[PDB]
Write a protein that holds these residues in place. Structure first.
Motif, PDB file in Angstrom:
ATOM      1  N   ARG A  36      -0.780 -10.101  -2.095  1.00 23.36           N
ATOM      2  CA  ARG A  36      -0.096  -8.819  -1.773  1.00 23.36           C
ATOM      3  C   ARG A  36       0.969  -8.000  -0.782  1.00 23.36           C
ATOM      4  NH1 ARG A  36      -2.246  -3.054  -3.095  1.00 23.36           N
ATOM      5  NH2 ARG A  36      -3.916  -3.752  -4.076  1.00 23.36           N
ATOM      6  N   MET A  38       4.248  -5.272   0.407  1.00 24.40           N
ATOM      7  CA  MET A  38       4.778  -4.482   0.554  1.00 24.40           C
ATOM      8  C   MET A  38       5.812  -4.331   0.829  1.00 24.40           C
ATOM      9  SD  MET A  38       0.952  -2.587   1.160  1.00 24.40           S
ATOM     10  CE  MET A  38       1.406  -1.008   0.653  1.00 24.40           C
ATOM     11  N   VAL A  47       0.010  -8.443   3.040  1.00 27.70           N
ATOM     12  CA  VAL A  47      -0.785  -7.689   3.644  1.00 27.70           C
ATOM     13  C   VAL A  47      -2.425  -8.633   2.899  1.00 27.70           C
ATOM     14  CG1 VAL A  47       0.040  -5.652   3.591  1.00 27.70           C
ATOM     15  CG2 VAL A  47      -1.146  -5.790   1.718  1.00 27.70           C
ATOM     16  N   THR A  48      -2.034  -9.315   2.462  1.00 27.64           N
ATOM     17  CA  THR A  48      -3.312  -9.676   1.378  1.00 27.64           C
ATOM     18  C   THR A  48      -3.381 -10.925   0.638  1.00 27.64           C
ATOM     19  OG1 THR A  48      -3.746  -8.754  -0.698  1.00 27.64           O
ATOM     20  CG2 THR A  48      -4.996  -7.549   1.081  1.00 27.64           C
ATOM     21  N   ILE A  97      -7.995 -10.698   3.706  1.00 27.45           N
ATOM     22  CA  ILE A  97      -6.959  -9.555   4.168  1.00 27.45           C
ATOM     23  C   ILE A  97      -6.172 -10.303   5.612  1.00 27.45           C
ATOM     24  CG2 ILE A  97      -7.319  -7.441   6.434  1.00 27.45           C
ATOM     25  CD1 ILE A  97      -8.393  -7.298   2.601  1.00 27.45           C
ATOM     26  N   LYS A  99      -3.688  -8.444   7.185  1.00 31.63           N
ATOM     27  CA  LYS A  99      -3.213  -7.229   7.993  1.00 31.63           C
ATOM     28  C   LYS A  99      -4.167  -6.166   8.174  1.00 31.63           C
ATOM     29  CE  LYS A  99      -0.406  -2.633   7.957  1.00 31.63           C
ATOM     30  NZ  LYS A  99       0.158  -2.925  10.099  1.00 31.63           N
ATOM     31  N   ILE A 101      -7.257  -3.028   7.925  1.00 29.97           N
ATOM     32  CA  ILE A 101      -6.811  -2.152   8.087  1.00 29.97           C
ATOM     33  C   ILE A 101      -8.357  -1.316   8.574  1.00 29.97           C
ATOM     34  CG2 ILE A 101      -4.922  -2.096   6.390  1.00 29.97           C
ATOM     35  CD1 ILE A 101      -7.126  -2.646   4.050  1.00 29.97           C
ATOM     36  N   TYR A 106      -8.499   0.814   2.776  1.00 34.61           N
ATOM     37  CA  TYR A 106      -8.488   0.620   1.806  1.00 34.61           C
ATOM     38  C   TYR A 106      -9.398   1.334  -0.027  1.00 34.61           C
ATOM     39  CZ  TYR A 106      -8.676  -2.958  -1.504  1.00 34.61           C
ATOM     40  OH  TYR A 106      -8.752  -4.503  -2.200  1.00 34.61           O
ATOM     41  N   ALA A 109      -7.087   4.076  -0.665  1.00 33.75           N
ATOM     42  CA  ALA A 109      -5.560   3.394  -1.338  1.00 33.75           C
ATOM     43  C   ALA A 109      -5.923   2.989  -2.884  1.00 33.75           C
ATOM     44  CB  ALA A 109      -4.783   2.575  -0.502  1.00 33.75           C
ATOM     45  N   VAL A 110      -6.845   1.872  -3.102  1.00 37.35           N
ATOM     46  CA  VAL A 110      -7.005   1.311  -4.516  1.00 37.35           C
ATOM     47  C   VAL A 110      -8.251   2.756  -5.490  1.00 37.35           C
ATOM     48  CG1 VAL A 110      -8.277  -0.800  -5.405  1.00 37.35           C
ATOM     49  CG2 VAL A 110      -7.289  -0.473  -3.199  1.00 37.35           C
ATOM     50  N   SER A 113      -5.527   4.925  -6.769  1.00 38.49           N
ATOM     51  CA  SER A 113      -4.632   3.892  -7.700  1.00 38.49           C
ATOM     52  C   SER A 113      -4.983   4.208  -8.952  1.00 38.49           C
ATOM     53  CB  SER A 113      -4.066   2.461  -7.673  1.00 38.49           C
ATOM     54  OG  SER A 113      -2.554   2.082  -6.818  1.00 38.49           O
TER      55      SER A 113
HETATM   56  O1  LIG Z   1      -0.730  -0.411   3.816  1.00 40.36           O
HETATM   57  C1  LIG Z   1      -1.418  -1.055   3.000  1.00 40.36           C
HETATM   58  C2  LIG Z   1      -1.810  -0.680   1.825  1.00 40.36           C
HETATM   59  C3  LIG Z   1      -2.876  -1.127   0.513  1.00 40.36           C
HETATM   60  C4  LIG Z   1      -3.127  -0.734  -0.553  1.00 40.36           C
HETATM   61  C5  LIG Z   1      -4.105  -1.093  -1.040  1.00 40.36           C
HETATM   62  C6  LIG Z   1      -4.507  -0.217  -3.256  1.00 40.36           C
HETATM   63  C7  LIG Z   1      -2.863   0.345  -2.869  1.00 40.36           C
HETATM   64  O2  LIG Z   1      -3.597   1.285  -4.598  1.00 40.36           O
HETATM   65  C8  LIG Z   1      -2.097   0.770  -2.538  1.00 40.36           C
HETATM   66  C9  LIG Z   1      -2.412   0.159  -1.132  1.00 40.36           C
HETATM   67  O3  LIG Z   1      -3.998  -2.556   0.914  1.00 40.36           O
HETATM   68  C10 LIG Z   1      -3.560  -2.914   1.927  1.00 40.36           C
HETATM   69  C11 LIG Z   1      -4.268  -4.233   2.612  1.00 40.36           C
HETATM   70  C12 LIG Z   1      -4.238  -5.071   3.977  1.00 40.36           C
HETATM   71  O4  LIG Z   1      -4.826  -5.252   4.680  1.00 40.36           O
HETATM   72  C13 LIG Z   1      -3.521  -3.476   5.050  1.00 40.36           C
HETATM   73  C14 LIG Z   1      -2.757  -3.216   4.643  1.00 40.36           C
HETATM   74  O5  LIG Z   1      -1.299  -3.159   5.455  1.00 40.36           O
HETATM   75  C15 LIG Z   1      -2.901  -2.888   3.302  1.00 40.36           C
END
Ligand SMILES: O=C1C[C@@H](c2ccc(O)cc2)Oc2cc(O)cc(O)c21
Length: 214
Positions: A36, A38, A47-48, A97, A99, A101, A106, A109-110, A113
């Motif tokens: 993944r 970004m 980031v993963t 992972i 980066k 977090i 996590y 954010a997911v 989405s």
């Molecule tokens: O900055 C992000 C975005 C994140 C993410 C997940 C789902 C989504 O829909 C949007 C962003 O995933 C991550 C996972 C990481 O180990 C470190 C990160 O910095 C990030």
């Protein structure tokens, strides 16, 4: 140092070529893996790393119409990835992972989405809302430093099991179980579907399955 050994890496990160989930004698093979990435302020951040696993012969038996297609033909076909997401076979995604977090970052954010993607498809109702709360709350309790691992397991398409591992080992049981067909499918679709977060994982899986079917 004297017999053949198979190693799989994603930008240097090792992935096991096979995973046998606890409680099972069935081996899941790595179909493909990617990252993944970004783009943040013009910086391309990895980031993963994401690996997709299934029983090779079993999943091939559910993808027979794609036999003989090249990786390029598969990777360009949304219908192929929809077949893969829907195939009624056991699947496992391993996330390493890169980066570090917070789990809440996590999960939040997911979850958002998946909420948005389900809404776009008109597949978001109160049942999915409740399932996504369970998903988010699981991750709120976790920390995801560099090197930690998330396991997403779909014993069937409608059931999502989740665990977080500090050492990459699979726990004897899932830490959380989310029973919702749409959320379970949507999470897999985050990786394999349209507007995928990892074109590299999709391309890798296309290479693996193309080879498998030949
Ligand atoms: O900055 C992000 C975005 C994140 C993410 C997940 C789902 C989504 O829909 C949007 C962003 O995933 C991550 C996972 C990481 O180990 C470190 C990160 O910095 C990030």
């Amino acid at each position: 140092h004297g017999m053949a050994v198979t190693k799989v890496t994603v930008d240097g990160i090792e992935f096991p070529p096979t995973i046998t989930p606890p409680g099972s004698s069935k081996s899941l093979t790595l179909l493909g893996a990617g990252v993944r990435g970004m783009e943040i302020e013009t910086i391309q951040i990895k980031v993963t790393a994401i690996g997709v696993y299934a029983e090779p012969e079993v999943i091939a038996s559910h993808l027979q119409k794609w036999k003989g297609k090249s990786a390029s033909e598969l990777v360009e076909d949304d219908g192929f990835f929809k077949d893969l997401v829907q195939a009624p076979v056991e699947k496992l995604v391993k996330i390493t992972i890169i980066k570090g977090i917070k789990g809440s970052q996590y999960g939040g954010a997911v979850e958002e989405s998946i909420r948005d993607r389900l809404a776009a498809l008109d597949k978001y109702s109160e049942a999915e809302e409740e399932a996504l709360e369970e998903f988010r709350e699981f991750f709120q309790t976790k920390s995801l430093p560099k090197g930690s691992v998330i396991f997403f397991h779909w014993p069937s398409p409608s059931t999502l099991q989740i665990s977080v591992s500090t050492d990459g080992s699979l726990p004897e049981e899932a830490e959380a179980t989310v029973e919702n067909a749409n959320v379970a499918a949507a999470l897999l679709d985050v990786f394999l579907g349209e507007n995928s977060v990892s074109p590299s994982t999709k391309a890798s899986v296309a290479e693996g399955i193309s080879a498998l079917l030949m």
